[PDB]
Amino acid sequence: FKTIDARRSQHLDLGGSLVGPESVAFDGKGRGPYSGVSDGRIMRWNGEAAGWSTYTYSPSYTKNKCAASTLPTVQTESKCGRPLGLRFHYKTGNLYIADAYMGLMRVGPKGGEATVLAMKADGVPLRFTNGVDIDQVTGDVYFTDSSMNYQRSQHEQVTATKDSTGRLMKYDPRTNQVTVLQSNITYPNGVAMSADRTHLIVALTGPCKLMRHWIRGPKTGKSEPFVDLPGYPDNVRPDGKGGYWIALHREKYELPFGPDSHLVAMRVSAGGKLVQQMRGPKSLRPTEVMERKDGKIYMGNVELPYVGVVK
């Protein structure tokens, strides 16, 4: 597993002044990246020719006439929503959205306006709904809230202040219920279920760590250290080979490796060992890394006006 070069990469441009396709989710039919962008919409990629089509959005997006808003998105975020985490339930074709302001939402295979499933957990409202993954067998949804204090706009303040008010939660699609599995977490972000489905791997952005929370067997409810990372992790996604790709939006240590050779992602094994690194420009600031069958690796962010593609 040689270091992947992210210097040369194809840009799937978003229209208008849209930026920050934080997640790069693929549906059960393998259709091109679905991405939650700066203005509150979840856009779908349909190739070079057709480009990005609107797929889904929060009820607040419609209600507040956000489509015809003139003001910069950083200001109209809490009104229009900011979709971060994306994952498809293959059996139904449903898309689960982790929206920073609008909480956990879901939409059908046809798309259109989404439905808010949860905006609160144990009476406390969700202020920074970030990471999501699905148990593909049961349809259970595991998602994170990064802070009770700071909204997405001040995500850097979660790190700066060492804020530890984050929550890891389960949404049960049968009982329509939201349980808090773990609270007082230091900036929980990305979440991925393990291949063997016994635990979750959760990214702690500020701490620069992955942790393991068990969801099955005698250790159910136990959170433990998994591995320390030399970068600030965002989203955790399976690499399609039993491990995970971890997006690293910043390095913890600026190692002098010459120009445009910054650590922007790490492939981690099921056992929590460092397998492979991806180095590229500092501007990439990746939030999600999605390897595919055809060797291509799709990359999300919160700042750039495109999805990046390497290999």
Author numbering: 38 to 348
Mind quoting what the paper says about this structure?
Ishimaru and Hirotsu et al. first identified THOUSAND-GRAIN WEIGHT 6 (TGW6), a gene that limits the number of endosperm cells and rice grain weight. From another point of view, the hydrolysis of IAA glycoconjugates by TGW6 has been considered to function in auxin metabolism.
The crystal structure of TGW6 was determined at 2.6 Å resolution and exhibited a six-bladed β-propeller structure. According to the result of structural similarity search, the structure of TGW6 was classified into six-bladed β-propeller structure. Furthermore, some proteins with structural similarity to TGW6, such as diisopropylfluorophosphatase (DFPase), gluconolactonase (XC5397)23 and drug resistance protein 35 (Drp35), retain calcium (Ca2+). Therefore, these results implied that the Ca2+ ion does not bind at the partially conserved Ca2+-binding site in TGW6 or that the binding affinity was very weak even if the ion interacted. Thermal shift assays revealed that TGW6 preferably interacted with indole compounds among the tested substrates, enzyme products and their analogs. Firstly, the docking pose of IAA-Glc was simulated when the IAA portion of the chemical structure bound to the inside of the molecule around phenylalanine (Phe)-165, histidine (His)-192 and tyrosine (Tyr)-224 in TGW6 (subpocket A; the interior portion of the nipped pocket), whereas that of Glc interacted at the site relatively close to the molecular surface around Glu-193, arginine (Arg)-287 and Glu-343 (subpocket B; the outer portion of the nipped pocket). The interaction map of IAA-Glc in the presence of TGW6 suggested that Tyr-224 was involved with hydrogen bonds, His-192 and His-286 interacted as aromatic-aromatic contacts, and Leu-121, Phe-165, His-286, threonine (Thr)-324 and valine (Val)-339 were engaged in hydrophobic interaction with the IAA substructure.
